[PDB]
mmCIF file with all atom_site columns, C-alpha atoms and ligand atoms in Angstrom:
data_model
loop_
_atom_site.group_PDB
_atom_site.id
_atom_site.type_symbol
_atom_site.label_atom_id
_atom_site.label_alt_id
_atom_site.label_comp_id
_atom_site.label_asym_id
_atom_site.label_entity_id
_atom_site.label_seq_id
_atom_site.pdbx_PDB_ins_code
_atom_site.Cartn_x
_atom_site.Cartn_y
_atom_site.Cartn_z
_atom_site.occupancy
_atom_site.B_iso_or_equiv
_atom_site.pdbx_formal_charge
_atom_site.auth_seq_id
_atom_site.auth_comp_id
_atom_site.auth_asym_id
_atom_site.auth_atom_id
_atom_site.pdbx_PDB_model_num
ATOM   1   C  CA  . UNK A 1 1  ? -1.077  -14.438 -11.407 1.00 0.00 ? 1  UNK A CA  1
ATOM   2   C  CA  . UNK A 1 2  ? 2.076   -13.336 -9.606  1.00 0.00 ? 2  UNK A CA  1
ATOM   3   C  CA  . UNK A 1 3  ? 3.893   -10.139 -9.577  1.00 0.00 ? 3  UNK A CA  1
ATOM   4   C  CA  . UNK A 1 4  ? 6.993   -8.994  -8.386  1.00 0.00 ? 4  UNK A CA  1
ATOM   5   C  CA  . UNK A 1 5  ? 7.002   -5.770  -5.989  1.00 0.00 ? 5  UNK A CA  1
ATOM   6   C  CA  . UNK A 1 6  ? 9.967   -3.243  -6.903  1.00 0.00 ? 6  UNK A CA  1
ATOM   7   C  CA  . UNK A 1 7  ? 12.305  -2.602  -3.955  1.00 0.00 ? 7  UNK A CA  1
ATOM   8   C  CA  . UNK A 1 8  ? 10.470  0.132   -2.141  1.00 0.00 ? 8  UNK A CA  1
ATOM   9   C  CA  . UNK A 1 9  ? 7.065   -2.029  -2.318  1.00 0.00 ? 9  UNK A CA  1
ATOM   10  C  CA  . UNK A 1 10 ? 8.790   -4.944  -1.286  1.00 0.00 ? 10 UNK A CA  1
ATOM   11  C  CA  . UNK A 1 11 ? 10.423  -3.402  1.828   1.00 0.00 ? 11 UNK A CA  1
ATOM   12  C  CA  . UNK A 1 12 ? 6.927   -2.430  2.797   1.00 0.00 ? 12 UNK A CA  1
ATOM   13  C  CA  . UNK A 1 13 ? 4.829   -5.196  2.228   1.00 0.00 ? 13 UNK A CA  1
ATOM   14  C  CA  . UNK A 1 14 ? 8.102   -7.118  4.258   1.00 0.00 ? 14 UNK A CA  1
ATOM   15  C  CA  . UNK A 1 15 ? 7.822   -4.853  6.679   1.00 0.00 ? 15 UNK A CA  1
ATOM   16  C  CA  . UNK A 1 16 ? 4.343   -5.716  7.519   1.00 0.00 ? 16 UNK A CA  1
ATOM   17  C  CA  . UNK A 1 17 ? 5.208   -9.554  7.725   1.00 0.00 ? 17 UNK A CA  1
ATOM   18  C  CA  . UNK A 1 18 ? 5.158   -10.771 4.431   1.00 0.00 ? 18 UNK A CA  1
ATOM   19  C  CA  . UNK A 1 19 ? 8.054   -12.999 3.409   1.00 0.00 ? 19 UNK A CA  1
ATOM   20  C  CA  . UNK A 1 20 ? 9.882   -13.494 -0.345  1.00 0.00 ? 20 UNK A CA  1
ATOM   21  C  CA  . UNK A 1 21 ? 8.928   -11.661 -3.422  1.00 0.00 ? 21 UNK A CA  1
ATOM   22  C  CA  . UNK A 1 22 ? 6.219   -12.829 -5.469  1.00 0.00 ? 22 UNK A CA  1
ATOM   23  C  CA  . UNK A 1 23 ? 2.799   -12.179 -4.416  1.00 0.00 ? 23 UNK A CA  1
ATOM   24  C  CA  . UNK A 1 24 ? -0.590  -11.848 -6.222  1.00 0.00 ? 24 UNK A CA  1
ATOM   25  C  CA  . UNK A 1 25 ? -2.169  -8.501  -6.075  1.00 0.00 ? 25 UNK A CA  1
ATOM   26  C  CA  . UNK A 1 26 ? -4.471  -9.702  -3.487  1.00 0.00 ? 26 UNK A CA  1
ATOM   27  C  CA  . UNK A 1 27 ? -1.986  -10.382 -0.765  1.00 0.00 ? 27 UNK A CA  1
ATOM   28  C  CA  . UNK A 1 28 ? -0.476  -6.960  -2.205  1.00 0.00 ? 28 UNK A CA  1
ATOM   29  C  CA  . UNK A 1 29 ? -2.790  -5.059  -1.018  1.00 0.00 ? 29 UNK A CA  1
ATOM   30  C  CA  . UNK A 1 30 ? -3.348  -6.804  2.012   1.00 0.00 ? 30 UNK A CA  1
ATOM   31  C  CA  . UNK A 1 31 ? 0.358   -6.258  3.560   1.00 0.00 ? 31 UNK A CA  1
ATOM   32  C  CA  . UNK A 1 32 ? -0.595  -2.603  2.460   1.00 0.00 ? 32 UNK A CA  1
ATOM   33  C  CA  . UNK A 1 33 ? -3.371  -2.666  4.763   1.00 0.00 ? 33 UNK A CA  1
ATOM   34  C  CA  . UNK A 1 34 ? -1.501  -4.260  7.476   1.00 0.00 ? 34 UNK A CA  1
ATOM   35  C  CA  . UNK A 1 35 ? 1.514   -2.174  7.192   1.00 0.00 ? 35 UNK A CA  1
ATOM   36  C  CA  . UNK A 1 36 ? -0.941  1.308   7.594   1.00 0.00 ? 36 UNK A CA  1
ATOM   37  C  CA  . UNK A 1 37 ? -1.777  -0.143  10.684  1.00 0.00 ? 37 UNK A CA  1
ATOM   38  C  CA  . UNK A 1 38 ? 1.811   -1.914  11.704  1.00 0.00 ? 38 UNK A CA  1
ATOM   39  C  CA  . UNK A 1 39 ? 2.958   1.753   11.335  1.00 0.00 ? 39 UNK A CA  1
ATOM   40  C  CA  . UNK A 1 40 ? 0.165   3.524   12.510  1.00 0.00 ? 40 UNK A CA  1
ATOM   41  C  CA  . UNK A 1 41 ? 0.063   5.859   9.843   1.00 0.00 ? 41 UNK A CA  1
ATOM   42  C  CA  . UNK A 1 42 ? -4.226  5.957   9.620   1.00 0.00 ? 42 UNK A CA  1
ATOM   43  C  CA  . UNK A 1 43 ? -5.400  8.219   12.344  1.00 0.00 ? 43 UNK A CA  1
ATOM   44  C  CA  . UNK A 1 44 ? -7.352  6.494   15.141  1.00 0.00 ? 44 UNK A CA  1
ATOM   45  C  CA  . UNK A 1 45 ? -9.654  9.493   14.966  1.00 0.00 ? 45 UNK A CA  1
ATOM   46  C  CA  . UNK A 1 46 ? -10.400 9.486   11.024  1.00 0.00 ? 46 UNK A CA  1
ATOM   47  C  CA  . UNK A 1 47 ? -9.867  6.128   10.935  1.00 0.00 ? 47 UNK A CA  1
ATOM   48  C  CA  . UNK A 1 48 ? -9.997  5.844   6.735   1.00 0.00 ? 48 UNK A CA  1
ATOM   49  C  CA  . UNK A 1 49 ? -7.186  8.412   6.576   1.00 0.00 ? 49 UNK A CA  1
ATOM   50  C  CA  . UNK A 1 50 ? -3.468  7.772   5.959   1.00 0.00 ? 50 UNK A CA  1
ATOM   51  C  CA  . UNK A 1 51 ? -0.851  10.766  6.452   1.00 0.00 ? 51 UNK A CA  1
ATOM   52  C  CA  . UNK A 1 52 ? 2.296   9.228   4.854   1.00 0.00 ? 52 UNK A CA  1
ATOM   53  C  CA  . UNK A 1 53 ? 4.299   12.234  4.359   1.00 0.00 ? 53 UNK A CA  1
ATOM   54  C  CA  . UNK A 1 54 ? 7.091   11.575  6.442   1.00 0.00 ? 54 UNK A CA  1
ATOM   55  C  CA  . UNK A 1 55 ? 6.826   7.464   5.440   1.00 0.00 ? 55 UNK A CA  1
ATOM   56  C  CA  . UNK A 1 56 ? 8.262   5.191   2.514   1.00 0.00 ? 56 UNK A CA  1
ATOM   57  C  CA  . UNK A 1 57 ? 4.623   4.836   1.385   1.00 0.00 ? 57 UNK A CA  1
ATOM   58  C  CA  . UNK A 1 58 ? 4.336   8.899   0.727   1.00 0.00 ? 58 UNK A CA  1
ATOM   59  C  CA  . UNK A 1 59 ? 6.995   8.674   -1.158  1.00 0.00 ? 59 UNK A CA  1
ATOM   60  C  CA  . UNK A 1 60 ? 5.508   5.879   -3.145  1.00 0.00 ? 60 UNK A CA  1
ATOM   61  C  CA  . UNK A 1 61 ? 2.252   7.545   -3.931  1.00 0.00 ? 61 UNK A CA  1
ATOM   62  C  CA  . UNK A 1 62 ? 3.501   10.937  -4.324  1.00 0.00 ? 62 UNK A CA  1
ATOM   63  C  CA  . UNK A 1 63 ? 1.172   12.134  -1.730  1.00 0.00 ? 63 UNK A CA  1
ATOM   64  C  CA  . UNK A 1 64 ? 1.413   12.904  1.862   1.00 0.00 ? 64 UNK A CA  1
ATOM   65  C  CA  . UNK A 1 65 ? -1.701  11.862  2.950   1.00 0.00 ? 65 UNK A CA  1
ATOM   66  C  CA  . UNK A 1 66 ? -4.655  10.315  1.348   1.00 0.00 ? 66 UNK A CA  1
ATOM   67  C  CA  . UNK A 1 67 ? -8.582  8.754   1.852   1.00 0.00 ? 67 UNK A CA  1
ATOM   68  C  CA  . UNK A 1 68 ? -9.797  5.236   2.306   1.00 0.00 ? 68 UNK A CA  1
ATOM   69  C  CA  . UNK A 1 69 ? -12.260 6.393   1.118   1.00 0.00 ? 69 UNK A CA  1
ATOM   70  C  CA  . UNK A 1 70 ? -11.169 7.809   -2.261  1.00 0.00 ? 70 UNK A CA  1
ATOM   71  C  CA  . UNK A 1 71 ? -7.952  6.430   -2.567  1.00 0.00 ? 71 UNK A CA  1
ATOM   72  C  CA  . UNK A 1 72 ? -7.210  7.284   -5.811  1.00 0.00 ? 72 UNK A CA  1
ATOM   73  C  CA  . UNK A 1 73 ? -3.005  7.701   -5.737  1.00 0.00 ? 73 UNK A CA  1
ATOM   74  C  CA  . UNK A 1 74 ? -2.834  4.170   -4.913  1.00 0.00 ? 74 UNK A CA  1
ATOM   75  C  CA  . UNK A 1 75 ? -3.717  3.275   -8.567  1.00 0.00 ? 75 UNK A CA  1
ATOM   76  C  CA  . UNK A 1 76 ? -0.980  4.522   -10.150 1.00 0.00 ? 76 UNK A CA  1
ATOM   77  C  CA  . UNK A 1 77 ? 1.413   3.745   -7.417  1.00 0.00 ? 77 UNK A CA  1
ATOM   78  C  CA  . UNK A 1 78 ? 0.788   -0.062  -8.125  1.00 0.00 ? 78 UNK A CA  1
ATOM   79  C  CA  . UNK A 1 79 ? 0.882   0.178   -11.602 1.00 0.00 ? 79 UNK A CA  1
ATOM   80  C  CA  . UNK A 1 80 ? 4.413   1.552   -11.001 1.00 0.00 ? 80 UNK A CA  1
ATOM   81  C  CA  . UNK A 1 81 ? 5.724   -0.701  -8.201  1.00 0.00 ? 81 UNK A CA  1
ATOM   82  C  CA  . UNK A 1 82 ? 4.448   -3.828  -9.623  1.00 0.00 ? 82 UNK A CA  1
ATOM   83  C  CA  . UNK A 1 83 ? 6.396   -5.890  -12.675 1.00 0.00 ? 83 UNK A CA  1
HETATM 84  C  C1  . WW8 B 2 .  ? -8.302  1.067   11.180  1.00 0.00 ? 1  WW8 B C1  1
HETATM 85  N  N1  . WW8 B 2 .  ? -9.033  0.019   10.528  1.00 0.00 ? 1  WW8 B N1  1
HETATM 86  C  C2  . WW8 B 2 .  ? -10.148 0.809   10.004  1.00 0.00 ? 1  WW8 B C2  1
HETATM 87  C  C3  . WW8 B 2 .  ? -8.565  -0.719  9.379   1.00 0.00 ? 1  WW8 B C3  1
HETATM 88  C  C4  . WW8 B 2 .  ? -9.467  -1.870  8.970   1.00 0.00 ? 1  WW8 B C4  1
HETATM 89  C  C5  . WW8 B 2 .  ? -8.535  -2.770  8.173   1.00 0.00 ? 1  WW8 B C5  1
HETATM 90  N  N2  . WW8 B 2 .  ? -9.145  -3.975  7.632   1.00 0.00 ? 1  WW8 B N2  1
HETATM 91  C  C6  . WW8 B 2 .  ? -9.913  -4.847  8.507   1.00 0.00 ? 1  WW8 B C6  1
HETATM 92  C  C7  . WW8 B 2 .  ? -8.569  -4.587  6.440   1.00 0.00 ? 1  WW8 B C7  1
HETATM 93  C  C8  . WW8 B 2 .  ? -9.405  -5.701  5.788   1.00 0.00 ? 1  WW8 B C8  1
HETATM 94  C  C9  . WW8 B 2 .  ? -8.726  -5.815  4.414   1.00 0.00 ? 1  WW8 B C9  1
HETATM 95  N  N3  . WW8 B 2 .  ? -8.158  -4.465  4.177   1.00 0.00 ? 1  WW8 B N3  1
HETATM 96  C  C10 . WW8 B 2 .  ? -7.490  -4.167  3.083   1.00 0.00 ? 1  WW8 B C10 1
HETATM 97  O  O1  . WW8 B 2 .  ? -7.307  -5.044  2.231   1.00 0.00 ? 1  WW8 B O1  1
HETATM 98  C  C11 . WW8 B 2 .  ? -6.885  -2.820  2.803   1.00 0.00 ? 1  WW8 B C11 1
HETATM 99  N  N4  . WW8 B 2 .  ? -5.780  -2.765  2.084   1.00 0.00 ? 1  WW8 B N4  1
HETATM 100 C  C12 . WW8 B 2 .  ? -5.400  -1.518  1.955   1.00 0.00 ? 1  WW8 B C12 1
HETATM 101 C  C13 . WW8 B 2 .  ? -4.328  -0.982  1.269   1.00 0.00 ? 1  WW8 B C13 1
HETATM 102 C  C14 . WW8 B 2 .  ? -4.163  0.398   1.259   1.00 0.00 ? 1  WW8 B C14 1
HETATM 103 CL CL1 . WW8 B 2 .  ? -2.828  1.100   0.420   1.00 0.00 ? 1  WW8 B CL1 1
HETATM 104 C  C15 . WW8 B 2 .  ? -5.084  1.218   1.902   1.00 0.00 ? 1  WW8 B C15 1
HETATM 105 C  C16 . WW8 B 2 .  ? -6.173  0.672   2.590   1.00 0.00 ? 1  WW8 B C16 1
HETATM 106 C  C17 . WW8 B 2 .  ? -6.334  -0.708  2.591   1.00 0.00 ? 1  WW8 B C17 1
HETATM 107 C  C18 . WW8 B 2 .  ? -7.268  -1.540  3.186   1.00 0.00 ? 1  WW8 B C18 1
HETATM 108 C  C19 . WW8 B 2 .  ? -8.427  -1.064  3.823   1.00 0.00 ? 1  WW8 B C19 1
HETATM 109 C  C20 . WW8 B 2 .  ? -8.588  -0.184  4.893   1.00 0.00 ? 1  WW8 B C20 1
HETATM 110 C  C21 . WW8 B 2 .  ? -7.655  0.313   5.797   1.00 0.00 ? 1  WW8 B C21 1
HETATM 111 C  C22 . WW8 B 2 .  ? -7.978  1.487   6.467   1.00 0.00 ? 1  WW8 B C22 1
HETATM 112 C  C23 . WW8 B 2 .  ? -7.112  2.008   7.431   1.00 0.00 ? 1  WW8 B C23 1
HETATM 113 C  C24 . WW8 B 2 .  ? -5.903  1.351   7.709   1.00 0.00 ? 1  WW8 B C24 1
HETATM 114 C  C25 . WW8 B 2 .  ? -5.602  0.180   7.016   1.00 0.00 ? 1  WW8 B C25 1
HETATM 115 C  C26 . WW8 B 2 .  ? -6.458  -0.334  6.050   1.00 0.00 ? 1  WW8 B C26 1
HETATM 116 N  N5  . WW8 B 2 .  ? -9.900  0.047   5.055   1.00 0.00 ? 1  WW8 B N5  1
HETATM 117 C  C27 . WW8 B 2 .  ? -10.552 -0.588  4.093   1.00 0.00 ? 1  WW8 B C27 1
HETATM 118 N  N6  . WW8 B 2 .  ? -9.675  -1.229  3.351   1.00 0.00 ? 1  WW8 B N6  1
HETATM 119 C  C28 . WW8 B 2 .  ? -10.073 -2.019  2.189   1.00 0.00 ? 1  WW8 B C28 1
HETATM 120 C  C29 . WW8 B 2 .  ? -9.577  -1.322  0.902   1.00 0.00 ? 1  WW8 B C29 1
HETATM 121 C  C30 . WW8 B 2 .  ? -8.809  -2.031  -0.006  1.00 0.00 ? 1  WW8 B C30 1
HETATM 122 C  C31 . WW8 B 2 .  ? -8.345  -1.432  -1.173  1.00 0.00 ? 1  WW8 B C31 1
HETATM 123 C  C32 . WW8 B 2 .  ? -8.619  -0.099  -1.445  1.00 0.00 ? 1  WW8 B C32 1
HETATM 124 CL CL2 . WW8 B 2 .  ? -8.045  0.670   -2.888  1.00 0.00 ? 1  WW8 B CL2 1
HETATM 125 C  C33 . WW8 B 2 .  ? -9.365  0.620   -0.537  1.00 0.00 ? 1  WW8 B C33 1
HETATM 126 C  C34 . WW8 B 2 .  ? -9.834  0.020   0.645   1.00 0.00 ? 1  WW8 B C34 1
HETATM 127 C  C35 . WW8 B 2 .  ? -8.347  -3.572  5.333   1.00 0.00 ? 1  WW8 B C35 1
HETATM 128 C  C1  . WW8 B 2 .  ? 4.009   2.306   -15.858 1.00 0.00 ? 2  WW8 B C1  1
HETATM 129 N  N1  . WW8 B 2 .  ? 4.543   0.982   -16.217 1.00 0.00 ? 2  WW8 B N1  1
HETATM 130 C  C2  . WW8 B 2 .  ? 5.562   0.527   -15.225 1.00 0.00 ? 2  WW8 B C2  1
HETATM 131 C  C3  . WW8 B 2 .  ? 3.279   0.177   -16.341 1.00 0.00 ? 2  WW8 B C3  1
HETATM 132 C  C4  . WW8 B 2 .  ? 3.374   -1.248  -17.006 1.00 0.00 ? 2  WW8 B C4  1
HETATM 133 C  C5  . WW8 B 2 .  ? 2.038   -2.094  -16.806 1.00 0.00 ? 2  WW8 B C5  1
HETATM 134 N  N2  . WW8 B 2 .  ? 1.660   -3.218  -17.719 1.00 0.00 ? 2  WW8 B N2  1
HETATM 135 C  C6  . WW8 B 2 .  ? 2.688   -3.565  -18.729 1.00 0.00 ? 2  WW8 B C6  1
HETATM 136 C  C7  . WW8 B 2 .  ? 0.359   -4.036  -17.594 1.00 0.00 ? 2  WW8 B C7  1
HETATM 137 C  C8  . WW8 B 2 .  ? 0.342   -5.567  -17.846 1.00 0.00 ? 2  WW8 B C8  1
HETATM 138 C  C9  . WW8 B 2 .  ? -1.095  -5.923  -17.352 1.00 0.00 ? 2  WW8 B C9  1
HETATM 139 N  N3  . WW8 B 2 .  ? -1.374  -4.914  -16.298 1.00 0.00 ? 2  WW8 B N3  1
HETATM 140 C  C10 . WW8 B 2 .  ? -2.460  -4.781  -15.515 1.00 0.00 ? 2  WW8 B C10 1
HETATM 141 O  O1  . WW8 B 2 .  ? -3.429  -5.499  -15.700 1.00 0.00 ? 2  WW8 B O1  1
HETATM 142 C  C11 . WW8 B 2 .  ? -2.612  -3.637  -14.507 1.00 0.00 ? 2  WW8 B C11 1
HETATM 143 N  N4  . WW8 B 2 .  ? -2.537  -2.381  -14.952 1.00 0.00 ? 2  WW8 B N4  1
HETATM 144 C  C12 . WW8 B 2 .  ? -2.703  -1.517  -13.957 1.00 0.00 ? 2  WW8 B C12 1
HETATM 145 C  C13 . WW8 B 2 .  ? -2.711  -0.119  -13.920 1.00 0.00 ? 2  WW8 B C13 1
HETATM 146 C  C14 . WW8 B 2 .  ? -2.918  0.561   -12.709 1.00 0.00 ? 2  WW8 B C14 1
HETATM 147 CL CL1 . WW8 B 2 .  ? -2.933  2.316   -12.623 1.00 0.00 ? 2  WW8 B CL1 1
HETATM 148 C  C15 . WW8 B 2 .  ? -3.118  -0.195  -11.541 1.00 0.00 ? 2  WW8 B C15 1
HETATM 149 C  C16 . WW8 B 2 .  ? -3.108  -1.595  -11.584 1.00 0.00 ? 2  WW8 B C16 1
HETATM 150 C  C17 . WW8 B 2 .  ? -2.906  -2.258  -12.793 1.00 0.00 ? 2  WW8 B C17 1
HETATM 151 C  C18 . WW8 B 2 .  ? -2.860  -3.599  -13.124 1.00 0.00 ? 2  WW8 B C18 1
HETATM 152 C  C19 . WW8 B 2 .  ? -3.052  -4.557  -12.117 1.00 0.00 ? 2  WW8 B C19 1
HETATM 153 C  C20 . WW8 B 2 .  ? -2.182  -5.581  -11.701 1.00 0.00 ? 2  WW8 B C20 1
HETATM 154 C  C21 . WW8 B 2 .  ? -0.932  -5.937  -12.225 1.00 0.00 ? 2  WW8 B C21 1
HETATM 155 C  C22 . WW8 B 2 .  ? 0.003   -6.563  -11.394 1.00 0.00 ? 2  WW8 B C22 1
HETATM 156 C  C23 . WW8 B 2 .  ? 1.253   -6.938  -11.899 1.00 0.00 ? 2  WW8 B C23 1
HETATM 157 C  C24 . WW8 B 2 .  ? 1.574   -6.706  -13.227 1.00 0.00 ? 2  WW8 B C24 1
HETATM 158 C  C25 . WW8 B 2 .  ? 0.639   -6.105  -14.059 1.00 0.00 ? 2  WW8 B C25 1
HETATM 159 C  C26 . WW8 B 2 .  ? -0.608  -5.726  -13.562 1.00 0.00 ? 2  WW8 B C26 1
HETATM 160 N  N5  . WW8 B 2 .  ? -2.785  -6.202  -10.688 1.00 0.00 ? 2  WW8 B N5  1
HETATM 161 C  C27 . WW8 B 2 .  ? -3.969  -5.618  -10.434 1.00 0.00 ? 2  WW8 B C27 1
HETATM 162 N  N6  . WW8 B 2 .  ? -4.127  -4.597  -11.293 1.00 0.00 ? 2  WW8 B N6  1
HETATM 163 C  C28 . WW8 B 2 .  ? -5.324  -3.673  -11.409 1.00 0.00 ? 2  WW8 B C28 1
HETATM 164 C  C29 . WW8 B 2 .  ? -5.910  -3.049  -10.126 1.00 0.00 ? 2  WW8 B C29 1
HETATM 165 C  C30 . WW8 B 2 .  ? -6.587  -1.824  -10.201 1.00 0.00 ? 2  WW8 B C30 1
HETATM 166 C  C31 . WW8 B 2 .  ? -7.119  -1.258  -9.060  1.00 0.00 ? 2  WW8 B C31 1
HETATM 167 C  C32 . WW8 B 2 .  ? -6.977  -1.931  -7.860  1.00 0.00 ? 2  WW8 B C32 1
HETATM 168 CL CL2 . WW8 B 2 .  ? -7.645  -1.181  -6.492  1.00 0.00 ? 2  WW8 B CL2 1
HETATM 169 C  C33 . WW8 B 2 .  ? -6.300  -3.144  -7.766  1.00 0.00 ? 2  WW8 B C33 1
HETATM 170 C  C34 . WW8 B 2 .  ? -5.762  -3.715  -8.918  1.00 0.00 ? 2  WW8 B C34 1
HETATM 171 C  C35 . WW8 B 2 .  ? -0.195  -4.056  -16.160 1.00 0.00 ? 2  WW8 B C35 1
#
């Protein structure tokens, strides 16, 4: 159960280590993990928030910063960065 990660989803989940461009959702969301941290984009102080604003991954979710905790933009996001 493979997708394929348009461009901008690709060049993040790449830039957090990941290599070619088929990956299950899984591993997806993994290198999304990884690359919050990679980029230190969650705050070490609220530690299940992401400010994104001025990243690829903002632009991706619409949003410039968003919860861990309720992370609802990421829904959509994959739904339109996945094929
Ligand atoms: C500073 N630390 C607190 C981070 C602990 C990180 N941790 C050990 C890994 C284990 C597997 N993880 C994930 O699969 C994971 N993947 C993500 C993908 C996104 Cl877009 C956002 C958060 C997480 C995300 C994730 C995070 C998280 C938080 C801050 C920075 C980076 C990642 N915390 C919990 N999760 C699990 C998770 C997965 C999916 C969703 Cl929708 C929400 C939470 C997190
Ligand atoms: C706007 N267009 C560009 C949309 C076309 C979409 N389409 C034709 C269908 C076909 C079946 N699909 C899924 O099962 C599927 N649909 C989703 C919708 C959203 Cl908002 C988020 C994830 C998925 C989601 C999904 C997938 C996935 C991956 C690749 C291709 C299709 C679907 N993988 C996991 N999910 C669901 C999901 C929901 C929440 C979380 Cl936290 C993680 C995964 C997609």
């Amino acid at each position: 159960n493979q997708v394929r990660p348009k461009l901008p989803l690709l060049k993040i989940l790449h830039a957090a280590g990941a290599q070619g461009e088929m990956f299950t959702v899984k591993e997806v969301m993994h290198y999304l993990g990884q690359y919050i941290m990679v980029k230190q984009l969650y705050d070490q102080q609220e530690q299940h928030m992401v400010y994104c604003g001025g990243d690829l991954l903002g632009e991706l979710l619409g949003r410039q910063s968003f919860s861990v905790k309720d992370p609802s933009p990421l829904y959509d996001m994959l739904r339109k960065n996945l094929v």
